[PDB]
Point group: C2
């Protein structure tokens, strides 16, 4: 899984891939939660003393759910204020999940927390304040809805002004929070190892050298995807480009750095890790592009298209894109 | 520039990128030459005793011409028999071009020779025989039409039964022809160095190891693109896929191996080499996909869609796709 934020003259652009082992193919769906929805949390958080059983949607939110392996967990969200939240795999947190300490805040099941944040908050600062004030916590130690074990994930929030927060569970069960903007190294997020280890790795590379990507090892792992996205995004020059050309430039650059093909095995895992789908967002204007790598097809839409919905709605978006749909078919939840 | 042939159950698939330095951006155009067209060669071939001044089109041919930097030279063609012909850059042939010896055959200016071959011949073996019999020769030592110097190019021919021919100008100005099928290493063609050197480089890598791509150096150079296309294609698994899925699998695999992003500089040249546009062909059925990397957009069409035309036609295809065209607007030449 990889994610890039790029500042542009047309908006803050975010691109994210959903990658997994080919033995358990992903299947992306979308849910829309309109303003004022009375929401009920999916799953249990029995490890924590207080549950976020119910909430109300404050901000119109679209949630991309992973149905193929993750049981419907919400992994990439955006709201009408241009806030984006996301969960990506972070296997190096696995040893520590059960050691997350309950601070007494209402705990949100990891199947829904990404959506819950979009539904409640408008800016990165708001979410960091809410965490600090004990408004909610992430239920790190609890299994996601319907799954057997706590999942090793790391979370991030990106707002329309390019403020980034990374939330990563590290040694001892510490919830570590990293802050930065879309020109910091936090504009890139992948998978394992943990963020300190990526930063250590990067110290040998001088990103100012436009030939530096050629000096970086290639692999399908999170380490190499992190380094290559950092290198290739440093030298991405968006001057004089149109909007369409700017979107395309991010896409192209991202794919060169981080699209994971089928058939390549990572010697560190003995497994593959192909990209199944991707999302591109303009957080300033609501533009969304959903691409399936299985069909190679993509649809462009806007969050505004769903703003008329008066009840939650759902779409098997990847399936529809794979069948050649040009518009989304929505169903009541 | 990179090119991949892949045998599939739905047909012989070919993918090719057109890559160049960013300081001279590419602009892809297309011409249609119907059967019976009286053709007049562009340019001169004054270094050669006999010129292919005029010929008649035998096979309905679509020619992809590069207008940005190569003055409208034909770089990628196909015909109604499924023959595909292409020219890619081969900078290691540059010191040898003036040493090519005129064999007395009618010489075809390099602006046209790729189209000429598709307009006259149906199979790879037919092209090989025509060369051997002296029916034409490449004007290696002559500048392409409208340009100052001989261009350092290499040529290849792929037919609908997957027979491949590579033509390179090697030390001392000798013309070397390699033959093989679409399972051989000739299924991949990039840029410098010459083929013997690519083969030498590849001896170190065991292509049967599915983790082998992770053991290969990455660069934007032809050497590294060759190696990675060979690796990634060796483990592409097309069983069970639909036709759409198969086309996409080739695309994505090719992109991971060989799509060159903007901004990365090659330390061997001190220049970049981004991909500007790409073409995908099914040689068995006439399907063609043209994608612009500048806009990210792609159109699908079929050669049969152009049999209606009784005189030559032309389209600024790249410009049209960049403006969001879904179908080609043809002009009389």
């Amino acid at each position: 899984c990889s994610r890039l934020v790029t500042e542009t003259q047309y908006g803050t652009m975010l691109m994210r891939t959903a990658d997994w082992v080919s033995t358990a193919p992903f299947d992306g769906h979308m849910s829309v939660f309109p303003v004022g929805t009375e929401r009920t949390m999916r799953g249990q958080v029995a490890e924590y003393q207080q549950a976020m059983t119910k909430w109300q949607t404050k901000y119109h939110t679209l949630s991309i759910e992973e149905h193929g392996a993750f049981g419907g967990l919400s992994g990439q969200t955006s709201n009408e204020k241009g806030l984006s939240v996301m969960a990506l795999s972070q296997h190096d947190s696995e040893p520590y999940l059960s050691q997350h300490k309950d601070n007494g805040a209402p705990a949100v099941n990891t199947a829904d927390v990404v959506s819950f944040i979009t539904e409640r908050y408008a800016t990165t600062a708001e979410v960091k304040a809410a965490l600090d004030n004990g408004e909610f916590q992430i239920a790190w130690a609890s299994a996601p809805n319907g799954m057997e074990h706590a999942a090793p994930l790391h979370y991030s929030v990106v707002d329309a002004d390019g403020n980034i927060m990374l939330i990563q569970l590290v040694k001892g069960g510490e919830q570590k929070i990293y802050l930065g903007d879309a020109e910091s190294d936090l504009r890139v997020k992948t998978n394992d190892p943990l963020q300190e280890k990526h930063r250590e790795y990067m110290q040998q590379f001088d990103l100012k050298d436009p030939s530096v990507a050629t000096k970086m090892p290639w692999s399908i792992g999170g380490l190499e995807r992190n380094s290559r996205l950092l290198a290739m995004s440093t030298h991405m020059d968006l001057e004089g480009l149109s909007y369409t050309e700017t979107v395309a430039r991010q896409k192209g650059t991202f794919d060169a750095a981080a699209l994971v093909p089928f058939g390549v095995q990572d010697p560190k895992t003995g497994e593959d890790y192909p990209s199944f789908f991707s999302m591109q967002y303009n957080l300033d204007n609501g533009d969304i592009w959903f691409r399936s790598l299985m069909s190679g097809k993509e649809i462009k839409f806007n969050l505004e298209d769903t703003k008329q919905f008066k009840t939650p709605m759902h779409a098997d978006i990847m399936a529809q894109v794979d069948k050649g749909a040009q518009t989304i078919t929505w169903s009541k939840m």
